[PDB]
Design a protein around this ligand. Structure first.
Ligand SMILES: Nc1ncnc2c1ncn2[C@@H]1O[C@H](COP(=O)(O)OP(=O)(O)O)[C@@H](O)[C@H]1O
Ligand SMILES: [Zn+2]
Length: 428
């Protein structure tokens, strides 16, 4: 006794965005049951080896994954990927990050024709650069309904300004399971090293000013610096929305540095939202975002989950091969490595499981939506007061893109890590 989204309904949705796995459409119809919501639809994914089993079938979970995630029977009982991701978020991630900042969503039934319609729609509405990317999987019979976190409330009460950050990893591993030649990993961030490789593959116009160790520092000055740095070189780490509409960033990691032209337009798109004179809104806005980030302490709870990566991939990869019952292709072995192989099967499972949960935390994004208060409105939830403009802003913070990482990807994490540290070493 609910509903199926049909071909008729497809006209009510408009393209908002996409990542590697999902398309996101925002609601544009009149029904109050959907105003201020988005729909998340899974892409058809080939050629992804990590999601196939021994026979090349894209099963919900492989036998190895079922064994690894055994402690939640509800998670392994999922009939499809939509149910799997929702139960992962609800049962594994929400206990860790809290229900306040995480929205598991509501599953909705969709017909093939609805999805075939959305397929054609995204083809027309996508930026030209994304036209050959993977479209909607039309064999799935479900999609996900979520609150649009680019909106504070379903409607407008000034405007809503929404800031989306992909913060990446905010800590450095210990030397405990890192080889002597790779020791720079304990002093230079993964993000900073990755920037060098990305620059070499000319995937970016220049090195990002952003340093995730600033964002997660616990220092209010350093948090501000991180925000300022993200404004200057957004790449794919920083976006700003005006009532759900892009006003900064959004062109992938290839997004250009904020030029005077983009800077000028941004300052004006802030008119009315920040009650400050022309040219001054941008500084006050960055201060606003910095204050909300720091004041919420939402990043402290995210850092702890990232810190579930105890051994680093260099250490963790050994536990992985013990799980899948294969001789280790990595082990001139170290004494630290051999002790890990001596660990009980149960603690070896725990380590890898915690590594994968950590990856979710390292690869997710935060959305901070803002609403300008009136002086005739009563006392506020969570808020930030900008003293120089005498303005109070209500804010909400939500974690998005909290996906379950497949077990076989451990191999990819190692390959990539090996490549990043190798390159960064010989560049010194
Ligand atoms: N609940 C939401 N509210 C508003 N915008 C969203 C929401 N979820 C996703 N988006 C937008 O869609 C984009 C891609 O969504 P995401 O779920 O991260 O895709 P993927 O899972 O493929 O990475 C995001 O960068 C964000 O701008
Ligand atoms: Zn080994």
């Amino acid at each position: 006794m609910e509903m199926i989204l049909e071909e008729k309904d497809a006209s009510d949705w408009i393209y908002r965005g996409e990542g590697g796995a999902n398309l996101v459409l925002a609601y544009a119809g009149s029904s109050p049951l959907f105003v201020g919501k988005v729909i998340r639809i899974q892409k058809a994914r080939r050629n992804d080896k990590a999601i196939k089993n021994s026979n090349g079938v894209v099963s919900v979970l492989t036998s190895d994954e079922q064994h690894l995630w055994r402690e939640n029977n509800e998670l392994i009982s999922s009939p499809n990927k939509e149910v799997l991701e929702q139960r992962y978020v609800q049962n594994v991630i929400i206990p860790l990050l809290g229900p306040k900042h995480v929205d598991a969503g509501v599953r909705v039934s969709v017909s093939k024709e609805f999805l075939e319609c959305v397929d054609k729609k995204v083809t027309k509405q996508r930026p030209l650069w994304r036209v050959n990317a993977a479209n909607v999987d039309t064999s799935h019979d479900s999609a996900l309904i979520l609150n649009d976190h680019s909106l504070f409330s379903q409607g407008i009460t000034g405007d809503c300004i929404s800031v989306e950050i992909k913060p990446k990893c905010g800590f450095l591993p210990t030397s405990r399971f890192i080889g002597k030649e790779n020791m720079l990993k304990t002093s230079v961030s993964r993000f900073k090293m990755h920037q060098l490789l990305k620059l070499e593959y000319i995937e970016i116009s220049e090195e990002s000013e952003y340093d995730p160790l600033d964002l997660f520092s616990g220092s209010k000055e350093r948090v501000l610096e991180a925000i300022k740095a993200l404004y200057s070189t957004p790449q794919n780490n920083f976006r700003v929305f005006l009532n759900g509409s892009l006003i900064l960033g959004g062109s992938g990691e290839s997004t250009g540095r904020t030029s005077p032209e983009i800077g000028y337009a941004f300052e004006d798109a802030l008119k009315g939202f920040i009650q400050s004179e022309d040219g001054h809104r941008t500084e006050c806005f960055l201060q606003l975002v910095s204050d909300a980030v720091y004041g919420s302490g939402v990043l402290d709870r995210l850092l702890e989950i990232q810190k579930l990566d105890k051994l680093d991939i260099e250490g963790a990869i050994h536990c992985y091969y013990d799980i899948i019952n294969q001789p280790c292709p990595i082990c001139r072995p170290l004494e630290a490595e051999l002790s890990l192989h001596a660990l009980p099967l149960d603690e070896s499972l725990k380590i890898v499981k915690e590594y994968l949960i950590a990856a979710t935390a390292k690869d997710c994004s935060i959305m901070i939506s803002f609403q300008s208060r009136n002086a005739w409105d009563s006392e506020p939830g969570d808020y930030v007061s900008l003293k120089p403009t005498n303005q109070t802003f209500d804010y909400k913070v939500h974690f998005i893109d909290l996906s379950l990482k497949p077990l076989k990807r451990m191999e990819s994490y190692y390959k990539l890590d090996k490549k990043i540290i190798s390159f960064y070493n010989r560049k010194q």
